[PDB]
Tab-separated table of C-alpha atoms (C1' of nucleotides) and ligand atoms in Angstrom:
chain	number	residue	atom	x	y	z
A	11	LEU	CA	-110.026	-78.667	-92.424
A	12	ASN	CA	-109.835	-82.176	-91.269
A	13	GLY	CA	-105.816	-82.773	-91.496
A	14	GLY	CA	-105.973	-84.026	-87.916
A	15	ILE	CA	-108.386	-86.716	-88.879
A	16	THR	CA	-106.746	-87.574	-92.400
A	17	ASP	CA	-103.301	-87.956	-90.675
A	18	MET	CA	-104.847	-90.253	-88.248
A	19	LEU	CA	-106.398	-92.318	-90.978
A	20	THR	CA	-103.178	-92.322	-92.885
A	21	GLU	CA	-101.115	-93.236	-89.641
A	22	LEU	CA	-103.564	-96.068	-89.035
A	23	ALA	CA	-103.212	-97.395	-92.541
A	24	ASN	CA	-99.500	-97.680	-92.365
A	25	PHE	CA	-99.610	-99.812	-89.417
A	26	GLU	CA	-102.069	-102.303	-90.965
A	27	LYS	CA	-100.077	-102.589	-93.926
A	28	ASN	CA	-96.559	-102.682	-92.411
A	29	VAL	CA	-97.109	-104.320	-88.871
A	30	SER	CA	-100.586	-106.127	-89.065
A	31	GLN	CA	-99.989	-107.201	-92.716
A	32	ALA	CA	-103.820	-106.451	-93.448
A	33	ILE	CA	-103.696	-104.818	-96.895
A	34	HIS	CA	-107.445	-104.476	-97.093
A	35	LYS	CA	-107.678	-102.621	-93.973
A	36	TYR	CA	-104.669	-100.293	-95.125
A	37	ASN	CA	-106.691	-99.555	-98.218
A	38	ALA	CA	-109.870	-98.929	-96.323
A	39	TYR	CA	-108.182	-96.199	-94.102
A	40	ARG	CA	-106.601	-94.632	-97.270
A	41	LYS	CA	-109.958	-94.583	-99.042
A	42	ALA	CA	-111.594	-93.051	-95.836
A	43	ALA	CA	-108.590	-90.442	-95.557
A	44	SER	CA	-108.908	-89.720	-99.088
A	45	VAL	CA	-112.697	-89.362	-99.302
A	46	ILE	CA	-112.314	-87.049	-95.856
A	47	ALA	CA	-109.620	-84.941	-97.806
A	48	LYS	CA	-111.877	-83.905	-100.602
A	49	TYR	CA	-114.653	-83.028	-98.173
A	50	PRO	CA	-115.128	-79.287	-98.215
A	51	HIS	CA	-116.395	-78.778	-94.583
A	52	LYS	CA	-114.855	-79.049	-91.150
A	53	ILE	CA	-116.054	-82.366	-89.683
A	54	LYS	CA	-118.092	-81.880	-86.288
A	55	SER	CA	-118.799	-85.683	-85.509
A	56	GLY	CA	-118.249	-89.241	-86.903
A	57	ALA	CA	-121.928	-89.212	-87.774
A	58	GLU	CA	-121.396	-86.558	-90.387
A	59	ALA	CA	-118.321	-88.433	-91.811
A	60	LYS	CA	-120.299	-91.732	-91.479
A	61	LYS	CA	-122.405	-90.223	-94.482
A	62	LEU	CA	-119.516	-90.406	-96.961
A	63	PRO	CA	-118.807	-93.451	-99.087
A	64	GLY	CA	-115.883	-95.341	-97.299
A	65	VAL	CA	-116.394	-94.485	-93.825
A	66	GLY	CA	-118.102	-96.946	-91.590
A	67	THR	CA	-118.875	-97.431	-87.889
A	68	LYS	CA	-115.387	-98.290	-86.614
A	69	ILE	CA	-113.922	-95.076	-88.392
A	70	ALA	CA	-116.934	-92.688	-87.353
A	71	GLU	CA	-116.112	-94.152	-83.838
A	72	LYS	CA	-112.267	-92.976	-84.170
A	73	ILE	CA	-113.293	-89.429	-85.231
A	74	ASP	CA	-115.636	-88.908	-82.199
A	75	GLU	CA	-112.978	-89.968	-80.057
A	76	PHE	CA	-110.255	-87.750	-81.942
A	77	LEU	CA	-112.749	-84.587	-82.016
A	78	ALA	CA	-113.367	-85.042	-78.167
A	79	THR	CA	-109.903	-85.904	-77.049
A	80	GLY	CA	-107.695	-84.432	-79.642
A	81	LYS	CA	-106.082	-88.039	-80.082
A	82	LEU	CA	-106.447	-91.580	-80.368
A	83	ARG	CA	-105.582	-94.041	-77.339
A	84	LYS	CA	-104.769	-96.894	-79.686
A	85	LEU	CA	-102.490	-94.705	-82.018
A	86	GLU	CA	-100.521	-93.123	-78.870
A	87	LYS	CA	-99.979	-96.654	-77.610
A	88	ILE	CA	-98.619	-97.685	-81.213
A	89	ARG	CA	-96.329	-94.859	-81.645
A	90	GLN	CA	-94.788	-95.607	-78.228
A	91	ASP	CA	-94.204	-99.260	-79.003
A	92	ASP	CA	-90.792	-99.744	-79.909
A	93	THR	CA	-91.361	-103.130	-82.252
A	94	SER	CA	-94.306	-101.772	-84.215
A	95	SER	CA	-92.735	-98.252	-84.840
A	96	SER	CA	-89.137	-99.914	-85.902
A	97	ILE	CA	-91.107	-102.372	-88.179
A	98	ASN	CA	-93.219	-99.364	-89.567
A	99	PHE	CA	-90.039	-97.410	-90.375
A	100	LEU	CA	-88.035	-100.148	-91.855
A	101	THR	CA	-90.802	-100.642	-94.609
A	102	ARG	CA	-89.762	-97.221	-95.888
A	103	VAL	CA	-86.711	-98.631	-97.161
A	104	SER	CA	-87.383	-99.751	-100.900
A	105	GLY	CA	-87.191	-103.420	-100.961
A	106	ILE	CA	-88.146	-103.931	-97.386
A	107	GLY	CA	-91.773	-104.974	-96.961
A	108	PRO	CA	-93.784	-106.046	-93.899
A	109	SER	CA	-92.089	-109.465	-93.910
A	110	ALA	CA	-88.600	-108.487	-94.170
A	111	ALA	CA	-89.165	-105.669	-91.658
A	112	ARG	CA	-90.785	-108.046	-89.159
A	113	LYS	CA	-87.788	-110.384	-89.617
A	114	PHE	CA	-85.035	-107.658	-88.920
A	115	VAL	CA	-86.696	-106.447	-85.950
A	116	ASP	CA	-86.932	-110.110	-84.296
A	117	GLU	CA	-83.168	-110.056	-84.744
A	118	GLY	CA	-82.656	-106.535	-83.120
A	119	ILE	CA	-82.121	-105.020	-86.674
A	120	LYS	CA	-84.348	-101.889	-86.049
A	121	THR	CA	-82.698	-98.687	-87.416
A	122	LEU	CA	-80.806	-97.503	-90.586
A	123	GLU	CA	-77.536	-97.987	-88.911
A	124	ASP	CA	-78.388	-101.730	-87.768
A	125	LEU	CA	-78.875	-102.130	-91.744
A	126	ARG	CA	-75.542	-100.761	-92.602
A	127	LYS	CA	-73.863	-102.932	-90.381
A	128	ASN	CA	-75.817	-105.885	-91.473
A	129	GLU	CA	-75.189	-105.432	-95.405
A	130	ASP	CA	-74.727	-109.357	-95.436
A	131	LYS	CA	-78.477	-109.842	-94.714
A	132	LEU	CA	-79.655	-107.539	-97.431
A	133	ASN	CA	-80.554	-108.271	-100.945
A	134	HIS	CA	-79.553	-106.366	-103.916
A	135	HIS	CA	-82.788	-104.258	-104.204
A	136	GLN	CA	-82.870	-103.504	-100.305
A	137	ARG	CA	-79.023	-102.385	-100.541
A	138	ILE	CA	-79.970	-99.980	-103.276
A	139	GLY	CA	-82.932	-98.997	-101.097
A	140	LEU	CA	-80.704	-98.386	-98.141
A	141	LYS	CA	-77.961	-96.579	-100.286
A	142	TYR	CA	-80.534	-93.805	-101.553
A	143	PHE	CA	-83.074	-94.072	-98.460
A	144	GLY	CA	-83.255	-90.170	-98.550
A	145	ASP	CA	-83.184	-89.289	-102.163
A	146	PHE	CA	-86.015	-91.915	-102.641
A	147	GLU	CA	-88.264	-90.150	-100.485
A	148	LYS	CA	-87.930	-86.572	-102.131
A	149	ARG	CA	-90.271	-85.307	-104.713
A	150	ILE	CA	-88.974	-84.412	-108.423
A	151	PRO	CA	-89.747	-81.166	-109.581
A	152	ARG	CA	-91.042	-81.019	-113.193
A	153	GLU	CA	-88.194	-79.068	-114.340
A	154	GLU	CA	-85.736	-81.861	-113.406
A	155	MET	CA	-88.475	-84.167	-114.890
A	156	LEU	CA	-88.323	-82.327	-118.320
A	157	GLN	CA	-84.418	-82.565	-118.177
A	158	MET	CA	-84.752	-86.213	-117.552
A	159	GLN	CA	-87.163	-86.713	-120.380
A	160	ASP	CA	-84.772	-84.798	-122.760
A	161	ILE	CA	-81.971	-87.469	-122.086
A	162	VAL	CA	-84.344	-90.476	-122.252
A	163	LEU	CA	-85.899	-89.346	-125.437
A	164	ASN	CA	-82.677	-88.461	-126.926
A	165	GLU	CA	-80.804	-91.557	-126.112
A	166	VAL	CA	-83.489	-94.159	-127.263
A	167	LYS	CA	-84.012	-92.297	-130.427
A	168	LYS	CA	-80.075	-92.735	-130.740
A	169	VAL	CA	-80.470	-96.558	-130.254
A	170	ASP	CA	-82.925	-97.098	-132.958
A	171	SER	CA	-84.984	-93.829	-134.331
A	172	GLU	CA	-87.954	-96.362	-134.673
A	173	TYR	CA	-88.612	-96.811	-130.807
A	174	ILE	CA	-91.316	-94.877	-129.318
A	175	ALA	CA	-90.912	-93.822	-125.597
A	176	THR	CA	-93.616	-91.882	-123.605
A	177	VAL	CA	-92.974	-90.436	-120.227
A	178	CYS	CA	-96.243	-91.383	-118.542
A	179	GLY	CA	-97.462	-90.872	-114.758
A	180	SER	CA	-98.383	-87.664	-113.114
A	181	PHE	CA	-95.641	-85.773	-115.201
A	182	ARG	CA	-97.664	-86.523	-118.366
A	183	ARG	CA	-100.865	-85.193	-116.437
A	184	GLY	CA	-98.939	-82.125	-115.980
A	185	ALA	CA	-97.969	-82.254	-112.327
A	186	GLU	CA	-95.286	-79.692	-111.084
A	187	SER	CA	-93.656	-82.592	-109.022
A	188	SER	CA	-93.319	-86.350	-109.421
A	189	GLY	CA	-92.401	-89.303	-107.117
A	190	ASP	CA	-90.827	-91.410	-109.978
A	191	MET	CA	-90.250	-91.697	-113.948
A	192	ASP	CA	-92.158	-94.130	-115.618
A	193	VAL	CA	-91.394	-94.758	-118.935
A	194	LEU	CA	-93.267	-96.620	-121.678
A	195	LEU	CA	-91.578	-98.131	-124.591
A	196	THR	CA	-92.525	-100.182	-127.825
A	197	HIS	CA	-90.948	-100.983	-130.980
A	198	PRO	CA	-92.823	-101.876	-134.477
A	199	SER	CA	-90.876	-105.328	-134.451
A	200	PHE	CA	-92.703	-105.930	-131.106
A	201	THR	CA	-96.382	-107.256	-131.260
A	202	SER	CA	-98.504	-109.382	-129.204
A	209	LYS	CA	-82.993	-107.420	-126.771
A	210	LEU	CA	-85.192	-104.501	-127.325
A	211	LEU	CA	-85.179	-103.278	-123.603
A	212	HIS	CA	-81.735	-104.182	-123.074
A	213	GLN	CA	-80.261	-101.903	-125.735
A	214	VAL	CA	-82.116	-99.005	-124.444
A	215	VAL	CA	-80.891	-99.640	-120.897
A	216	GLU	CA	-77.419	-100.197	-121.910
A	217	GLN	CA	-77.333	-96.833	-123.719
A	218	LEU	CA	-78.723	-94.943	-120.751
A	219	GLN	CA	-76.162	-96.362	-118.335
A	220	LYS	CA	-73.440	-95.756	-121.077
A	221	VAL	CA	-74.116	-92.149	-120.886
A	222	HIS	CA	-74.221	-92.567	-117.273
A	223	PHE	CA	-78.042	-91.653	-116.705
A	224	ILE	CA	-78.932	-95.048	-115.018
A	225	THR	CA	-76.707	-95.632	-112.172
A	226	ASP	CA	-78.173	-98.617	-110.484
A	227	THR	CA	-80.427	-101.574	-111.270
A	228	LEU	CA	-83.251	-103.083	-108.858
A	229	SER	CA	-84.357	-105.588	-111.296
A	230	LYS	CA	-84.278	-106.082	-115.049
A	231	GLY	CA	-85.992	-108.780	-117.487
A	232	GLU	CA	-87.354	-108.923	-121.157
A	233	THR	CA	-89.977	-106.390	-120.568
A	234	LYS	CA	-89.518	-104.589	-117.474
A	235	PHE	CA	-86.672	-102.406	-115.833
A	236	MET	CA	-86.461	-100.887	-112.523
A	237	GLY	CA	-83.431	-98.896	-111.476
A	238	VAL	CA	-81.866	-95.556	-110.318
A	239	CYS	CA	-80.918	-92.537	-112.360
A	240	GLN	CA	-79.472	-89.164	-111.889
A	241	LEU	CA	-79.181	-85.797	-113.923
A	242	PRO	CA	-75.535	-84.618	-114.318
A	243	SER	CA	-74.099	-81.948	-112.361
A	248	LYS	CA	-73.989	-79.351	-106.144
A	249	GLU	CA	-75.434	-82.750	-107.260
A	250	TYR	CA	-78.970	-83.852	-108.330
A	251	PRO	CA	-80.368	-86.601	-105.950
A	252	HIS	CA	-80.450	-90.054	-107.418
A	253	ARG	CA	-84.064	-90.827	-108.727
A	254	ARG	CA	-86.351	-93.951	-109.194
A	255	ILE	CA	-87.104	-94.648	-113.062
A	256	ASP	CA	-89.049	-97.505	-114.604
A	257	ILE	CA	-89.157	-98.713	-118.105
A	258	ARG	CA	-91.625	-101.031	-119.673
A	259	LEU	CA	-91.588	-102.471	-123.093
A	260	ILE	CA	-95.084	-103.124	-124.529
A	261	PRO	CA	-96.213	-104.602	-127.630
A	262	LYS	CA	-97.305	-101.912	-130.249
A	263	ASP	CA	-100.648	-103.061	-130.482
A	264	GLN	CA	-101.363	-102.703	-126.669
A	265	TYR	CA	-99.040	-99.535	-126.485
A	266	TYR	CA	-101.897	-96.867	-126.258
A	267	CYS	CA	-103.898	-98.801	-123.755
A	268	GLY	CA	-100.599	-99.108	-121.562
A	269	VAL	CA	-100.097	-95.210	-122.018
A	270	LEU	CA	-103.825	-94.602	-121.069
A	271	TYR	CA	-103.594	-96.748	-118.213
A	272	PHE	CA	-99.942	-95.672	-116.881
A	273	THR	CA	-101.107	-92.012	-117.212
A	274	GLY	CA	-103.894	-92.078	-114.838
A	275	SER	CA	-105.023	-90.973	-112.723
A	276	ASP	CA	-106.604	-93.837	-110.604
A	277	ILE	CA	-109.897	-92.040	-110.228
A	278	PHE	CA	-109.960	-91.368	-113.857
A	279	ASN	CA	-109.118	-94.944	-114.702
A	280	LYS	CA	-112.010	-96.011	-112.709
A	281	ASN	CA	-114.532	-93.600	-114.096
A	282	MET	CA	-113.424	-94.540	-117.723
A	283	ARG	CA	-113.730	-98.288	-117.043
A	284	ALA	CA	-116.980	-97.948	-115.491
A	285	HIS	CA	-118.316	-95.693	-118.566
A	286	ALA	CA	-116.852	-98.449	-120.899
A	287	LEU	CA	-118.768	-100.892	-119.197
A	288	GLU	CA	-122.283	-99.178	-119.954
A	289	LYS	CA	-121.167	-98.470	-123.364
A	290	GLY	CA	-120.349	-102.472	-123.830
A	291	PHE	CA	-116.806	-102.390	-123.549
A	292	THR	CA	-114.137	-103.677	-120.881
A	293	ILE	CA	-111.002	-101.529	-120.596
A	294	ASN	CA	-107.733	-103.576	-119.484
A	295	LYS	CA	-104.257	-102.115	-119.124
A	296	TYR	CA	-103.511	-104.590	-122.236
A	297	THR	CA	-106.614	-104.384	-124.679
A	298	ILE	CA	-110.130	-103.009	-125.100
A	299	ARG	CA	-112.492	-105.619	-125.902
A	300	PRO	CA	-116.316	-105.797	-126.629
A	301	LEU	CA	-118.827	-107.684	-124.573
A	302	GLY	CA	-121.530	-110.029	-125.939
A	303	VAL	CA	-125.208	-110.230	-124.805
A	304	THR	CA	-124.027	-113.142	-122.646
A	305	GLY	CA	-121.011	-111.297	-121.353
A	306	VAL	CA	-118.550	-113.072	-123.584
A	307	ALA	CA	-115.588	-110.617	-124.194
A	308	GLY	CA	-114.554	-110.635	-128.000
A	309	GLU	CA	-111.032	-110.261	-129.587
A	310	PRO	CA	-109.303	-107.200	-128.727
A	311	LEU	CA	-110.009	-103.964	-130.850
A	312	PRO	CA	-107.244	-102.297	-132.985
A	313	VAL	CA	-105.526	-99.270	-131.176
A	314	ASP	CA	-103.354	-96.986	-132.890
A	315	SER	CA	-103.823	-94.009	-130.469
A	316	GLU	CA	-105.366	-92.964	-127.082
A	317	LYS	CA	-108.182	-91.206	-128.956
A	318	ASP	CA	-109.293	-94.563	-130.565
A	319	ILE	CA	-110.237	-95.877	-126.786
A	320	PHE	CA	-112.339	-92.798	-126.400
A	321	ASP	CA	-113.985	-93.200	-130.039
A	322	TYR	CA	-114.782	-96.867	-129.103
A	323	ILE	CA	-116.861	-96.026	-125.974
A	324	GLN	CA	-118.178	-92.741	-127.384
A	325	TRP	CA	-116.142	-90.607	-125.399
A	326	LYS	CA	-114.792	-87.064	-125.825
A	327	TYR	CA	-110.642	-87.286	-126.257
A	328	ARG	CA	-109.610	-86.391	-122.568
A	329	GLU	CA	-106.403	-84.517	-122.345
A	330	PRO	CA	-103.861	-85.974	-119.772
A	331	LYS	CA	-104.064	-82.417	-117.772
A	332	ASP	CA	-107.627	-83.207	-117.198
A	333	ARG	CA	-107.493	-86.684	-116.052
A	334	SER	CA	-107.979	-86.317	-112.212
B	1	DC	C1'	-123.232	-113.375	-92.726
B	2	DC	C1'	-119.549	-113.367	-95.588
B	3	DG	C1'	-116.321	-113.037	-99.886
B	4	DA	C1'	-114.299	-108.906	-102.732
B	5	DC	C1'	-111.169	-105.427	-102.164
B	6	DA	C1'	-105.862	-105.499	-109.091
B	7	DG	C1'	-102.946	-108.231	-111.008
B	8	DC	C1'	-98.457	-108.758	-112.892
B	9	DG	C1'	-93.018	-108.692	-113.570
B	10	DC	C1'	-88.859	-109.915	-111.464
B	11	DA	C1'	-85.944	-111.782	-107.651
B	12	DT	C1'	-85.644	-115.113	-104.550
B	13	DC	C1'	-87.117	-118.527	-101.526
B	14	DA	C1'	-89.276	-123.630	-100.499
B	15	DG	C1'	-90.065	-128.117	-102.209
B	16	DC	C1'	-88.890	-131.906	-104.913
C	1	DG	C1'	-81.059	-128.592	-111.251
C	2	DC	C1'	-86.261	-127.389	-112.236
C	3	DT	C1'	-91.371	-125.549	-110.801
C	4	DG	C1'	-94.190	-123.142	-108.186
C	5	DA	C1'	-94.828	-120.019	-103.911
C	6	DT	C1'	-93.698	-115.991	-101.838
C	7	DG	C1'	-92.415	-110.977	-101.394
C	8	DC	C1'	-91.952	-106.815	-103.196
C	9	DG	C1'	-93.140	-102.750	-105.974
C	10	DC	C1'	-96.217	-100.632	-108.783
D	1	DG	C1'	-112.452	-101.745	-92.349
D	2	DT	C1'	-116.348	-101.129	-95.564
D	3	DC	C1'	-119.564	-102.384	-99.281
D	4	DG	C1'	-122.848	-105.075	-101.049
D	5	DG	C1'	-124.693	-109.722	-102.612
E	401	CL	CL1	-106.389	-109.288	-122.995
E	402	NA	NA1	-120.453	-94.606	-94.966
E	403	NA	NA1	-90.188	-100.939	-98.529
DNA sequence: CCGACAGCGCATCAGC
DNA sequence: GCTGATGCGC
DNA sequence: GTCGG
C-alpha cells in the first residue's frame, strides 16, 4: 500500500541516526514509518497522513513530494553522496556506530575491504562484526531457534540443575523467525561466577564461538549450531536476580507496543512497571518497596489483568 | 516556545 | 594507576 | 521531527 513511503521514511531514519547523529529524528521517522505501515489505506496526500499520530508537517510535505514526483530530491542527493553513503554502510557492521563510521570515512576507509586491510584500527567487537557481517544480517528460522534452545537448556541444566533459563524475545512470542537469541538466566543463590560457568560450558561444547563482551551479569557473543554449515548467530545471556527474574522475562519478551500498553494500564491501576520490579504508587506519587513476584501472572494480578500469552503480545 | 524522546552493561577512551 | 565520560548495542 | 506542557 504505502511501501514507497515507508521505505522513504526508513531510509531517512537511517541517515539521521548514522550520518547526522540525530537519534531523536531517527526515532521520529521510524515511528512515522511504523504507523503508516499499519494504516490500511493507500495514502493519497500528505494531509491524509498528517492525521496519523507521529506524522507532522515536514513528513506530510515529504509525502506530497513523493506522491507527485515518485521520489525525494533530498534522498536522491544523499544516495549519490560518497561520504554519507559510506558512513551509512559502515554502521551495518556490529560495533561500528556513527562515530567510528565517521572516523573511518575521514581516513579513506569506506568499504568492507578497507576494513579488512585495516584490522589494526578495529577493536575486538568490530573485528567480530566484520568477520560475521553477512551472517549477522540473516534471520534465524524458528526451527533453528528451537535447536539452539535445546542446546542452551541442556548445557545450562548440566552445569547446575537449579539454574532457570528462558529464551525470550520474538521467539517466545512464537515468531517464525528471529534476529538473535536472547537468554535470561537466574539462580536461587542470586538475589537483589554464575554466568561464567554457563558461558564456559557452552563454549566447551563449541556452541559459543566468539565473545563480544562479558561481565558478571551480561554476556554478548556469537554461536553456531553443529553441521553445509549453519551461519553464526548473535546470542545474549543475562543473569538476573531471582526476585526480579519474571519482571525481566516479561520485559525482554515484548513486544515494545505491548510493554507500553501494559505500563500505561499499570499506572491507571496505581502501579509502576520497571524491567526490574513492580511498585505501588502512593497518593503523592511516592513509589513503595518492590512487590514480591514469582511468575509472570503475578504482574497481571497486581494490575488486575488477565494473563496474556506471549503469542498474543503485539 | 521549548524540553522529552529509555536506560543500562560492558569496552574503551580522556583526564587526572 | 583510578575515575568518569563516551560509544555501542539492545 | 513530533508531541505536548
Ligand atoms: Cl527499582
Ligand atoms: Na499527526
Ligand atoms: Na554498527
